[PDB]
Design a protein around this ligand. Structure first.
Ligand SMILES: Nc1ccn([C@@H]2CS[C@H](COP(=O)(O)OP(=O)(O)OP(=O)(O)O)O2)c(=O)n1
Ligand SMILES: [Cl-]
Ligand SMILES: [Cl-]
Ligand SMILES: [Mn+2]
Ligand SMILES: [Mn+2]
Ligand SMILES: [Mn+2]
Ligand SMILES: [Mn+2]
Ligand SMILES: [Mn+2]
Ligand SMILES: [Mn+2]
Ligand code: NA
Ligand code: NA
Ligand code: NA
Ligand code: NA
Ligand code: NA
Length: 328
DNA sequence: GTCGG
DNA sequence: GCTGATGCGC
DNA sequence: CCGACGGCGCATCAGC
């Protein structure tokens, strides 16, 4: 049903291999950019030289596309699929907190399966231990109905802590997705500005007291990463990833732009900002110094002002998701 | 792996 | 302590 | 060994 789905799946799989096995994050990012520009292309790709016209597809991917169109497979991928070490390394990196490095370490020490991982809980740090505990739950996506229920608990508890907080659910939810991988809550409070608690900790602690937050992956002064769960209906819902991030109140628009994603959109926007002579992060957009210090932050009164600076047409959150096209 | 310089 | 990497996460 | 590639929080380490 997906136009060019065979091609985009091949490139994604190559991506994951370069990240997890090769530890080559820019090759990962290259395959992702290629899968992405191909996914958004509104025609069926006839040949490698056709895909090559797209930014991000070059000689080597063009050849893989010719091989794939011609044979229905890619020998490079068949060999990777046959490498049990590579397969186990890929699998282990699905646990939150285990990356390419840890994964290879565990596999080299003979941990190759989920059971093997469970038997070796003592090798895992806290984050990894919690990732493992909820591995099955974290594989499932969250229906938007349940995201609405989750949003209701979060906003009500935050308002009980202090009515000056504003919490906004971002990520895929704000982009209008019909399901989400986690819940991203952007939080502000007038006591925390770029110039100026316990602000985050008070919120987290209140969510724990009402048994909504069940576990913590990591937690600092400005960012919480953890686990939550909706109250059961009779006798249970899966446990869910939740990210909460306090951002400076005077820097809300850069913050919400960031927290809305998608991942690929944000990166592409920042790459286009560099080309135009700016640097964008979640707090500011700044001109690049002739030296190599960014200069003073530019004024921003809306999401659109950020786009304007880098000469990009404004996109509504729903148009910042990745998309694909279909065939009959 | 792709691209720009 | 601070700075700057390394790993891993949004 | 062309070098850059988006950018930063939290956890941790190395060097000072
Ligand atoms: N590589 C990345 C990853 C995330 N981000 C930011 C962090 S906050 C925002 C949303 O990140 P998430 O990882 O929750 O993704 P989405 O909400 O798009 O999807 P799901 O959670 O999978 O529904 O994008 C980024 O700028 N670069
Ligand atoms: Cl790389
Ligand atoms: Cl900044
Ligand atoms: Mn579809
Ligand atoms: Mn398109
Ligand atoms: Mn062993
Ligand atoms: Mn999300
Ligand atoms: Mn998230
Ligand atoms: Mn551009
Ligand atoms: Na190209
Ligand atoms: Na191997
Ligand atoms: Na992981
Ligand atoms: Na053990
Ligand atoms: Na569960």
């Amino acid at each position: 049903e997906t136009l060019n789905g065979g091609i985009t799946d091949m490139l994604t799989e190559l991506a994951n291999f370069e990240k997890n096995v090769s530890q080559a994050i820019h090759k990962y990012n290259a395959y992702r950019k290629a899968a992405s520009v191909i996914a958004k292309y509104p025609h069926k790709i006839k040949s490698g030289a056709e895909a090559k016209k797209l930014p991000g597809v070059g000689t080597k991917i063009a050849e893989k596309i010719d091989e794939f169109l011609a044979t229905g497979k890619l020998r490079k991928l068949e060999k990777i699929r046959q490498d049990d070490t590579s397969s186990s390394i890929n699998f282990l990196t699905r646990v939150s907190g285990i990356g390419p490095s840890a994964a290879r370490k565990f596999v080299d020490e003979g941990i190759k399966t989920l059971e093997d991982l469970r038997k070796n809980e003592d090798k895992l740090n806290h984050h990894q231990r919690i990732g493992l505990k909820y591995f099955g739950d974290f594989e499932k996506r969250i229906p938007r109905e349940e995201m609405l229920q989750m949003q209701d608990i979060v906003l009500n508890e935050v308002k009980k802590v202090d009515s000056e907080y504003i919490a906004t659910v971002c990520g895929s939810f704000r982009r209008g997705a019909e399901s989400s991988g986690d819940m991203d809550v952007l939080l502000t409070h007038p006591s925390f500005t770029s110039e100026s608690p316990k602000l985050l900790h008070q919120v987290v602690e209140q969510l724990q007291k009402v048994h909504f937050i069940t576990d913590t992956l990591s937690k600092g002064e400005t960012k919480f990463m953890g686990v939550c769960q909706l109250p059961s209906k009779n006798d249970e819902y899966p446990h869910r990833r939740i990210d909460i991030r306090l951002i400076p109140k005077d820097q809300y628009y850069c913050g919400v732009l960031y927290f809305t994603g998608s991942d690929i959109f944000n990166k592409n926007m920042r790459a286009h900002a560099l080309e135009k002579g700016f640097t964008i992060n979640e707090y500011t957009i700044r001109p690049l110094g002739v030296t190599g210090v960014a200069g003073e932050p530019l004024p921003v009164d809306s999401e659109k002002d950020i786009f304007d600076y880098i000469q990009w047409k404004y996109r509504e959150p729903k148009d910042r998701s990745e998309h694909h096209h279909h065939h009959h």
